[PDB]
Enzyme design. Structure first.
Site, PDB file in Angstrom:
ATOM      1  N   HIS B  81       0.836  -1.194   0.000  1.00  0.00           N
ATOM      2  CA  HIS B  81       0.000   0.000   0.000  1.00  0.00           C
ATOM      3  C   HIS B  81       0.875   1.250   0.000  1.00  0.00           C
ATOM      4  CE1 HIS B  81      -2.896   3.045   1.049  1.00  0.00           C
ATOM      5  NE2 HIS B  81      -3.882   2.166   1.061  1.00  0.00           N
TER       6      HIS B  81
HETATM    7  N1  LIG Z   1      -4.428 -10.730   6.437  1.00  0.00           N
HETATM    8  C1  LIG Z   1      -4.867  -9.519   5.731  1.00  0.00           C
HETATM    9  N2  LIG Z   1      -4.187  -9.347   4.725  1.00  0.00           N
HETATM   10  C2  LIG Z   1      -4.427  -8.137   4.068  1.00  0.00           C
HETATM   11  O1  LIG Z   1      -3.597  -7.588   3.105  1.00  0.00           O
HETATM   12  C3  LIG Z   1      -5.586  -7.421   4.414  1.00  0.00           C
HETATM   13  C4  LIG Z   1      -6.178  -7.665   5.673  1.00  0.00           C
HETATM   14  N3  LIG Z   1      -5.896  -8.849   6.299  1.00  0.00           N
HETATM   15  N4  LIG Z   1      -6.435  -6.532   6.413  1.00  0.00           N
HETATM   16  C5  LIG Z   1      -5.932  -5.280   6.238  1.00  0.00           C
HETATM   17  C6  LIG Z   1      -5.702  -4.954   4.774  1.00  0.00           C
HETATM   18  C7  LIG Z   1      -4.366  -4.326   4.486  1.00  0.00           C
HETATM   19  N5  LIG Z   1      -4.451  -2.876   4.739  1.00  0.00           N
HETATM   20  C8  LIG Z   1      -5.097  -1.846   3.924  1.00  0.00           C
HETATM   21  C9  LIG Z   1      -5.027  -0.562   4.489  1.00  0.00           C
HETATM   22  C10 LIG Z   1      -5.787   0.455   3.868  1.00  0.00           C
HETATM   23  C11 LIG Z   1      -6.416   0.299   2.582  1.00  0.00           C
HETATM   24  C12 LIG Z   1      -7.149   1.477   2.077  1.00  0.00           C
HETATM   25  O2  LIG Z   1      -7.737   1.389   0.976  1.00  0.00           O
HETATM   26  N6  LIG Z   1      -7.185   2.669   2.788  1.00  0.00           N
HETATM   27  C13 LIG Z   1      -7.349   4.002   2.169  1.00  0.00           C
HETATM   28  C14 LIG Z   1      -8.072   4.858   3.125  1.00  0.00           C
HETATM   29  C15 LIG Z   1      -8.676   6.100   2.437  1.00  0.00           C
HETATM   30  C16 LIG Z   1      -9.197   7.252   3.344  1.00  0.00           C
HETATM   31  O3  LIG Z   1      -9.403   7.045   4.558  1.00  0.00           O
HETATM   32  O4  LIG Z   1      -9.400   8.381   2.831  1.00  0.00           O
HETATM   33  C17 LIG Z   1      -6.037   4.747   1.687  1.00  0.00           C
HETATM   34  O5  LIG Z   1      -5.950   5.061   0.479  1.00  0.00           O
HETATM   35  O6  LIG Z   1      -5.130   5.048   2.501  1.00  0.00           O
HETATM   36  C18 LIG Z   1      -6.247  -0.962   1.892  1.00  0.00           C
HETATM   37  C19 LIG Z   1      -5.643  -2.065   2.607  1.00  0.00           C
HETATM   38  N7  LIG Z   1      -5.925  -6.196   3.898  1.00  0.00           N
HETATM   39  C20 LIG Z   1      -6.470  -5.989   2.509  1.00  0.00           C
HETATM   40  O7  LIG Z   1      -5.933  -6.800   1.425  1.00  0.00           O
END
Ligand SMILES: Nc1nc(=O)c2c([nH]1)NC[C@@H](CNc1ccc(C(=O)N[C@@H](CCC(=O)O)C(=O)O)cc1)N2C=O
Ligand SMILES: Nc1nc(=O)c2c([nH]1)NC[C@@H](CNc1ccc(C(=O)N[C@@H](CCC(=O)O)C(=O)O)cc1)N2C=O
Lengths: 325, 319
Positions: B81
């Protein structure tokens, strides 16, 4: 090293103490390894899956039956799944270094000893059936526990082992030998009547000799589970090599679609042979023109297409027999 | 009582002791109730979702930030990310009895206190942006942590709050206010590049989907790729549309989609809108909300990576 799989079904899926007592009876029997215990409260049934040498699994099945005799009272049992005995069906399946004939012998040994000790009627089915009419479990089970008193007064229903007596707390037990069987339920948002209609259209026996079903080597009924608040087309795949998971699932989906009923995943009961899942993966890969080389991906694909995670997580290492043994 | 949702993202998704320490910082803050913690080892990021009164969530976010400042060292951080700070983004969303304007004030209060207390650069985004160019998080985060040293030397990148110094262990933080956002990932049995190519064709910034941001990455722990998306306004483009479009693009390349994953919480209507889509498509009639939710969970494959429990994931069921 000879290995046989024994998959006895007991009429108790609510009382954990009873379920666990039967588990201990099996697990504590020399030579037996308990691989899975799958219990359902609305179906009110539990299937135990264990393996071991031919003679050892027979002893394990008997120890389980003895414990069940003391803990289950069929006169008070009710559930969505059909049944006629505390230990409803006890199948022996060849896994390694064992012929189907020996498993038949195991079924005969088990049946004779069970009948002698408890004084209950025992029927032989599958490859151990003495007559064609007793090959099918549903045929033997027709009328269920409630029909036993009347059936036991008829010569045609004379048990293979034991007295033709009605024992209220136990009912009757079916024992036999067969190849791997897949207990597969398909979830649908419908009435039990609609699910049963689909079951009758698809199961080989259909609605009768003059009304055969669409799928060979498939048994099925429809029900509704208070526990999950949904209906299911419950099926048994007697020979996945003839009719596999993908076929049963896709055909159920088609029939449901014709009635504007949605299928919402499925549920495997007990264990499954790796090949059954890989066969299904091959089907979807061909249908979708996919190219996968890793078994883990093939399994992930099938799990998603059939929706095997719908009611609970599907863990390959705990559900695929080759991964457990 | 007033309720505001705070969904801060921290650059740590592997060290459970660190993740738990930050969770405690939030949970132990008076007035804050932690509803969800989602951590990923490949993305190496954790999303915390909590609610409380306006000022309470600001204090909770600050306590979480202070704990993170001592436990996270960005000079050693890498993940799937995009990121530029230990506490990468801290959004404030209105839930009950609070206006967007008040949430913007919360974002501004949090942003300034964070910047001045920890001595780090803070930027404002979303409804709290001080300039149009900073409304977008992707624009502010361009170049990521690695680009900070050079960016901070430019007047154009002067932070909204705090010193313009490069702090190796922390990086920079973005704070803001916005409406509910859905973090939705679609699983693909493909390479990281293939997933990213699809993301590029679907994201509005390009793309086909309005109000949707997307990138592609790989989850080593699950041995699969994902088209990771953010639905900025599900009323404009919902879960069903994003899923179906991703499926279509994948089919064009003979790549199979195998379910999806929601990160964090979701408003009930987002799921019900998706349910209506499938009911229209399949000519269904379902009276029960439980069934409508069950339908969408199955169609989108929301239980692919972990069970999707409605009572623990739907906002209206948690409030
Ligand atoms: N075991 C596991 N593996 C993973 O990779 C998985 C989970 N669990 N849980 C958490 C997450 C990995 N973390 C994330 C963190 C944030 C975003 C995200 O899209 N956040 C936005 C928030 C935008 C805003 O608040 O304005 C960003 O762009 O920062 C995606 C994945 N995830 C998923 O595969
Ligand atoms: N929570 C839950 N709810 C359920 O209703 C449920 C589960 N779990 N677990 C598994 C199963 C309950 N147990 C069982 C056990 C066996 C069969 C079964 O189909 N046995 C075949 C065996 C045939 C043979 O060996 O030849 C039979 O026809 O008797 C059905 C249900 N089940 C949902 O079903």
């Amino acid at each position: 090293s000879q290995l046989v799989e024994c998959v006895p079904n007991f009429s108790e899926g609510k009382n954990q103490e009873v379920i666990d007592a039967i588990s201990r009876a099996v697990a504590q029997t020399p030579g037996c390894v308990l691989l899975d215990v799958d219990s359902g409260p609305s179906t009110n049934r539990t299937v135990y899956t264990f393996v071991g040498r031919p003679e050892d699994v027979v002893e394990g099945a008997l120890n389980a039956a003895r414990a069940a005799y003391q803990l289950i009272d069929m006169s008070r049992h009710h559930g969505e799944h059909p049944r006629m005995g505390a230990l409803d069906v006890c199948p022996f399946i060849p896994v390694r270094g064992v012929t189907m004939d020996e498993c038949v012998r195991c079924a005969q040994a088990f049946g004779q000893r069970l009948a002698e000790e408890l004084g209950v009627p025992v029927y032989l089915y599958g490859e151990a059936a003495r007559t064609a009419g007793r090959q099918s479990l549903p045929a033997l089970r027709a009328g269920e526990y409630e029909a036993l008193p009347e059936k036991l007064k008829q010569a045609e229903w004379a048990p293979d082992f034991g007295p033709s007596a009605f024992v209220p707390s136990w009912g009757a037990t079916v024992a036999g030998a067969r190849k791997f069987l897949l207990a597969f339920n398909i979830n649908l948002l419908s009435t039990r009547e609609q699910a049963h209609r689909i079951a009758l259209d698809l199961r080989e026996q259909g609605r009768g000799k003059d009304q055969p079903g669409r799928l060979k080597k498939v048994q099925a009924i429809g029900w509704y589970l208070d526990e999950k608040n949904l209906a299911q087309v419950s099926t048994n795949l007697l020979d996945f090599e003839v009719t596999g998971l993908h076929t049963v699932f896709e055909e159920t989906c088609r029939e449901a679609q014709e009635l504007s009923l949605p299928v919402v995943g499925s549920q495997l009961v007990g264990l499954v042979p790796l090949k059954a899942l890989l066969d299904a993966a091959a089907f979807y890969c061909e249908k979708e023109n996919l190219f996968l080389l890793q078994d883990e991906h093939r399994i992930r694909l099938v799990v998603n297409r059939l929706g095997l995670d719908s009611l609970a997580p599907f863990k390959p290492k705990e559900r695929i027999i080759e991964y457990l043994v």
